[PDB]
Amino acid sequence: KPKLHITMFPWVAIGHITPFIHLANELAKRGHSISILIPKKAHTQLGHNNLYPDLIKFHIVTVPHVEGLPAGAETASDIDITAKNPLAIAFDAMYEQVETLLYGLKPDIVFYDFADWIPKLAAQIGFKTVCYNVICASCMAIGIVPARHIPKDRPLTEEELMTPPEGYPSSTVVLRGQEARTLSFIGMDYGATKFDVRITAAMQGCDAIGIRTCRELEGPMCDYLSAQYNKPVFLSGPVLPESPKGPLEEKWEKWLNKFEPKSVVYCAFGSQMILQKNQFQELVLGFEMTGLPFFVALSKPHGADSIEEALPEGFLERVGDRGVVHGGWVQQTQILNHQSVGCFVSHCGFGSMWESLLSDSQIVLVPRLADQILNTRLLAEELKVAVEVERGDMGWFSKEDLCKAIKSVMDEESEVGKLVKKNHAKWRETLVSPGYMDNYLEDFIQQLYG
Amino acid sequence: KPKLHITMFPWVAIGHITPFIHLANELAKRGHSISILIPKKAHTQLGHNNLYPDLIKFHIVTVPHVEGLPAGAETASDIDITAKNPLAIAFDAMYEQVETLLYGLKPDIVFYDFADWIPKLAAQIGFKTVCYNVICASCMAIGIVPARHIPKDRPLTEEELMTPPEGYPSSTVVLRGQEARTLSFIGMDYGATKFDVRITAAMQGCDAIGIRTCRELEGPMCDYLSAQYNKPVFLSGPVLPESPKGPLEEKWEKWLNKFEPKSVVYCAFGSQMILQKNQFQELVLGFEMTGLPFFVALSKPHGADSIEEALPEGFLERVGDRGVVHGGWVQQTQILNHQSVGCFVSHCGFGSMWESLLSDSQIVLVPRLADQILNTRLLAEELKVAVEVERGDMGWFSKEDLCKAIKSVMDEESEVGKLVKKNHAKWRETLVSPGYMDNYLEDFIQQLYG
Numbered sequence: 001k002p003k004l005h006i007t008m009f010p011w012v013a014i015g016h017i018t019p020f021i022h023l024a025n026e027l028a029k030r031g032h033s034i035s036i037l038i039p040k041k042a043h044t045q046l047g048h049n050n051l052y053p054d055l056i057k058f059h060i061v062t063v064p065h066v067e068g069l070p071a072g073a074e075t076a077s078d079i080d081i082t083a084k085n086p087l088a089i090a091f092d093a094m095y096e097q098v099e100t101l102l103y104g105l106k107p108d109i110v111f112y113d114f115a116d117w118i119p120k121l122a123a124q125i126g127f128k129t130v131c132y133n134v135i136c137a138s139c140m141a142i143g144i145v146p147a148r149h150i151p152k153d154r155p156l157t158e159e160e161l162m163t164p165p166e167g168y169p170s171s172t173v174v175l176r177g178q179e180a181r182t183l184s185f186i187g188m189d190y191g192a193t194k195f196d197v198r199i200t201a202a203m204q205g206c207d208a209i210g211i212r213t214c215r216e217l218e219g220p221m222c223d224y225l226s227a228q229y230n231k232p233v234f235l236s237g238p239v240l241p242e243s244p245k246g247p248l249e250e251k252w253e254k255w256l257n258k259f260e261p262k263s264v265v266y267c268a269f270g271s272q273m274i275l276q277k278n279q280f281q282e283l284v285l286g287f288e289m290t291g292l293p294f295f296v297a298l299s300k301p302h303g304a305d306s307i308e309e310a311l312p313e314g315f316l317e318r319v320g321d322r323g324v325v326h327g328g329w330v331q332q333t334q335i336l337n338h339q340s341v342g343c344f345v346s347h348c349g350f351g352s353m354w355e356s357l358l359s360d361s362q363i364v365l366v367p368r369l370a371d372q373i374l375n376t377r378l379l380a381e382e383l384k385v386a387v388e389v390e391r392g393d394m395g396w397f398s399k400e401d402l403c404k405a406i407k408s409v410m411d412e413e414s415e416v417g418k419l420v421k422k423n424h425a426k427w428r429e430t431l432v433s434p435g436y437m438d439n440y441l442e443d444f445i446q447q448l449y450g
Numbered sequence: 451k452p453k454l455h456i457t458m459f460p461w462v463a464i465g466h467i468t469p470f471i472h473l474a475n476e477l478a479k480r481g482h483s484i485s486i487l488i489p490k491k492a493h494t495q496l497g498h499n500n501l502y503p504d505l506i507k508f509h510i511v512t513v514p515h516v517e518g519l520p521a522g523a524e525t526a527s528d529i530d531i532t533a534k535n536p537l538a539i540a541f542d543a544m545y546e547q548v549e550t551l552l553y554g555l556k557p558d559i560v561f562y563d564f565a566d567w568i569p570k571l572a573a574q575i576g577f578k579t580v581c582y583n584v585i586c587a588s589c590m591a592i593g594i595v596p597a598r599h600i601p602k603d604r605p606l607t608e609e610e611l612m613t614p615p616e617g618y619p620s621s622t623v624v625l626r627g628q629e630a631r632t633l634s635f636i637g638m639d640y641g642a643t644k645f646d647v648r649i650t651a652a653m654q655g656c657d658a659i660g661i662r663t664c665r666e667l668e669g670p671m672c673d674y675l676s677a678q679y680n681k682p683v684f685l686s687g688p689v690l691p692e693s694p695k696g697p698l699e700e701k702w703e704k705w706l707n708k709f710e711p712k713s714v715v716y717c718a719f720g721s722q723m724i725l726q727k728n729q730f731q732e733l734v735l736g737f738e739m740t741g742l743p744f745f746v747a748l749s750k751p752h753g754a755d756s757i758e759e760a761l762p763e764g765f766l767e768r769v770g771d772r773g774v775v776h777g778g779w780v781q782q783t784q785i786l787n788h789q790s791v792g793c794f795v796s797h798c799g800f801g802s803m804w805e806s807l808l809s810d811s812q813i814v815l816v817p818r819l820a821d822q823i824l825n826t827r828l829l830a831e832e833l834k835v836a837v838e839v840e841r842g843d844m845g846w847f848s849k850e851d852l853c854k855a856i857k858s859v860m861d862e863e864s865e866v867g868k869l870v871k872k873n874h875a876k877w878r879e880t881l882v883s884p885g886y887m888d889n890y891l892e893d894f895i896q897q898l899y900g
C-alpha cells in the first residue's frame with residue numbers, strides 16, 4: 001500500500017506541538033509524509049527536532065493580531081492568563097490560511113486537537129481526521145463527555161467538578177474536594193466559545209479519537225470515551241522520544257558514586273513548573289528531614305536571585321554533602337539510570353511518569369495539575385506502584401508529609417515500600433519488553449488505514 | 451415526550467418568511483411551541499396567517515438603518531437591486547437583538563437560512579440548529595456545494611456556471627447555454643461577504659439540513675447534499691398550505707361552463723412575476739394561435755394603464771369569448787379543479803408546481819428563474835409528466851413555441867400528450883395518497899427530536 005500523507009495542525013502551545021512532532025517522527029520513520037503547520041516562533045524553537053527532513057515538512061501559519069493580543073504573541077508561552085481569549089480567537093482566525101494550505105497539501109488524514117473547525121474543512125476538502133490528545137484519557141473521560149452536563153451560562157460548582165460523569169469507569173481515579181478547582185478549566189471561556197463546547201465539537205467531528213496512551217494503563221477510560229462519543233479510539237502509545245545519549249555530567253556521576261546503590265533520592269518537577277518560595281523552602285526542608293542523600297533539580301522561585309538566596313537560612317551548612325539543590329537543567333534519564341539513585345520524587349508529569357515507570361526507582365508523586373493528580377491516583381491508588389504525598393488546600397505540601405512518603409518507600413523495613421516495588425517491577429517488565437512500544441505504533445498506523 | 455420549543459429566524463423576504471410560517475403552522479398543530487422573529491411590516495402583512503396563536507408567537511425585530519438603505523425598507527420586496535448589499539448588512543446587523551431574544555426564548559431548535567452567524571449563537575447559548583431551505587434541493591446541489599470551487603475574487607464564467615459539480619446526480623436536471631446567468635447569484639456579493647461564503651458557512655454550521663421537498667421527487671439531490679456537507683438532511687415535505695375552501699367566482703364558473711370538459715387552457719405565472727409588454731403580447735398571441743379556449747390570469751406590464759391597453763391591436767375583437775385575459779388575482783386552485791380545465795401553463799414556481807402535480811390537468815412549463823428551470827427539467831425531462839417551452843437568450847419565448855407546446859399536450863392525437871398524462875397520473879396517485887404529506891411531517895418532527 002502507498003504511504004500516507006498526514007497533515008498536523010496542533011494548538012499553539014509548546015506542550016501540544018512537541019508531542020505531535022514526536023508522533024510525526026515515528027510516522028516518518030515508517031515512511032509516511034508529514035506536514036506540520038505551526039507559528040514562526042515555535043518553528044524556530046523546535047526546528048532541530050525534525051529527524052526526517054525529507055518526509056517531515058514545516059509550513060508556517062501566521063497568528064493574526066486581534067483585539068487584545070500582545071504584540072509578537074504566537075504561542076501560549078508568550079501570553080499570561082489575561083490574553084487567553086485573544087490567543088484562542090487568533091487561533092480560530094487562522095482557519096482560512098489552514099484551508100488554503102490543506103487545498104494544496106491534499107492530505108489523506110489531518111491530526112488536530114483544539115481546532116474544532118477542522119472537520120468542517122474535512123468535508124469541504126475531502127480528508128479524514130483524527131482528534132489526537134496528548135493529555136491523559138482519564139482527564140478527557142472524567143471531564144468533557146456527553147454524560148456530564150455543563151451549563152453554558154454559569155461555571156460548574158466544586159461539587160459538580162468533584163462528581164464523575166455517569167458511567168465513569170473508576171472509583172479510584174477521581175478528584176477529591178480540594179482538587180476540584182484543578183478541573184475547572186473544562187468549562188472556562190476559551191475565545192469565542194467555552195472550552196467544553198470546543199472540545200465536544202472536536203470529539204464529535206473527528207473520524208477517530210487518538211490518545212497518547214496504552215491499553216494496559218488506561219483501557220477502561222478509552223472504552224468509556226469510545227462509547228460516549230460513539231467513535232473508534234486509536235492508541236498511539238506514549239510515543240516517548242529517544243532519551244538523551246552521551247555521558248552523564250562527570251561531577252554528578254562522581255558525587256552520586258560517593259553514595260551507596262539505590263540510596264539517593266532524585267527530585268524534579270518537569271520543565272514548566274516553578275515553585276513559590278515558601279513551598280520551595282518547605283520542599284528542601286522535607287528532603288533534609290529524611291536524613292537520606294538527595295539530588296533535587298528545581299528552578300529557583302520567581303524573582304529570586306539564586307537558589308541559595310531562596311533557600312532557608314542555615315540549610316546549606318547543615319546538609320553538607322548529603323544533598324544537592326541545583327537550579328540548572330540536568331540529564332534526568334541518565335541520573336535515573338545511575339545505580340546510586342533509588343527514588344524519584346516528581347509531579348507525575350507525562351514524561352516523568354513514564355520515566356519513573358521504566359526505571360527501577362521507587363516512585364513518589366507530588367502532583368499539581370488535574371492530569372498529574374489523576375495519573376497519581378492511577379499509579380498510587382489503582383496500580384499501587386507508587387505513593388502519593390498528602391497535600392493541602394492549594395496543593396500545598398508540608399515537609400513532614402513529604403518526608404514520611406519518601407521514608408515509606410525507602411526503608412527496607414517498610415511493608416508499603418516492598419509492596420510498591422514489587423508492583424512496580426511487574427509493570428516495568430511489561431512496559432520494557434521488546435516490541436511493546438512498536439506494537440502500538442504499528443497498530444495505530446494500521447488503524448489509520450481503515 | 452415533551453413538546454419542542456422552536457425559534458425561526460428567516461431571511462427578510464416574504465418568499466422566505468411565508469414557508470417558514472407554513473412549517474410553523476404544521477408544527478404547532480402537533481403541539482410544538484414556535485417563536486418567529488420578523489420585521490414589523492412583514493408581521494402586519496402576514497399576521498393573519500397564524501392559525502395557532504397560543505403556540506405560535508411573533509417577535510418583532512427592528513431592521514437597522516445602515517448606509518444606502520432606503521427609508522422604511524425592511525424586506526427584499528421594499529428594495530430594488532441597488533440596495534441588495536445594504537439590506538444584507540442590515541439583516542446581519544440585527545445579530546444583537548436576535549441574540550437577546552434567543553437568550554429569553556431559550557429554544558430547543560432554531561431554524562435559519564441566510565443568517566450564517568446563527569450557529570455561532572448556537573454555540574454560545576446552547577441550542578441545536580436546522581438550516582431550512584425553501585428552494586429546491588437540485589438548486590442547492592448544483593450550486594453551492596464543496597465539489598464546486600468558487601473564487602473569492604473573480605466571478606464564475608458562464609461555462610463554470612453551466613458545468614454541474616463533480617458527482618452531481620442528474621444528467622437531466624441541468625442548465626443550458628444562455629440559462630447560465632440564472633445561477634450567477636451563487637457568487638454574487640451579498641453584504642459583507644459573497645453569497646456562496648455565507649451559504650457555505652450556514653450549511654456547514656447547522657446541526658442538520660432541512661429541505662422543503664420529498665424523497666420521491668428529489669432523493670438523489672438530498673443524498674448528494676448530505677454526502678457533500680457530511681450532514682443529515684431532513685425532508686419536511688412540500689408543506690403545502692390548505693387551499694382556500696371558497697365557492698369559485700360565479701362569473702368564471704359560468705364562463706368555464708360554456709366550454710367542453712378538459713378543453714380549457716389555464717395560465718398563471720405566480721404572485722411575483724410581471725411580464726414586459728413585448729413578452730406579454732407574444733404570450734397572448736400564442737394562446738390565440740392554438741385556437742383553444744384559454745384563461746390567462748396575469749398582472750399587466752409595469753406602468754401600463756390596463757391589461758387591454760397592453761394587448762396587441764385587435765386581439766380582443768378576434769378572440770371574442772374564446773379566451774379571457776384577466777389582470778386580477780384569481781382562485782387558481784378552484785379553477786384548476788373545474789372540469790372544463792384540461793391544461794395549466796405556468797412558470798413552475800413552487801406552489802404552481804405542486805398544484806399542477808396534484809391536478810389532473812396537463813402541465814406546460816415556462817420557467818424564468820433558476821429553480822423554476824431545474825424543476826421544469828425534472829418534470830418535463832426527468833419524469834416526463836410535463837412539456838417545456840423553448841426559450842430564448844433572455845428567457846424570451848416565441849408565440850409559435852408556446853402554441854406548439856400547448857398543442858402537443860392538448861391534442862388527443864398527440865403521442866406526447868398521451869405520455870405526459872399517463873406519467874402525471876402515476877405521480878398524482880402517489881402524491882395524493884392518504885398520509886403521504888403527514889408521514890413526511892411526522893418523520894421530520896421525529897428527526898428533530900433526534
Ligand SMILES: O=c1ccn([C@@H]2O[C@H](COP(=O)(O)OP(=O)(O)O)[C@@H](O)[C@H]2O)c(=O)[nH]1
Nearest residue numbers: 268270271272297329330332349350351352
Ligand atoms: O531537569 C530536568 C527536568 C525535566 N527533564 C525532562 O523534561 C521532560 C518533560 O517533563 P514532564 O513531561 O515529566 O513534565 P512537564 O515538563 O510536562 O511539566 C521529561 O522527559 C524529563 O526527563 C529533564 O530532562 N531535566
Ligand SMILES: O=c1ccn([C@@H]2O[C@H](COP(=O)(O)OP(=O)(O)O)[C@@H](O)[C@H]2O)c(=O)[nH]1
Nearest residue numbers: 718720721722747779780782799800801802
Ligand atoms: O392569480 C393567482 C396567481 C397565483 N395564485 C397562487 O399563488 C401561489 C404562489 O405561486 P407560485 O408559488 O407558483 O409562484 P411564486 O409566487 O413563488 O412566483 C400559488 O399557490 C397559486 O395558487 C393564485 O391563487 N392566484
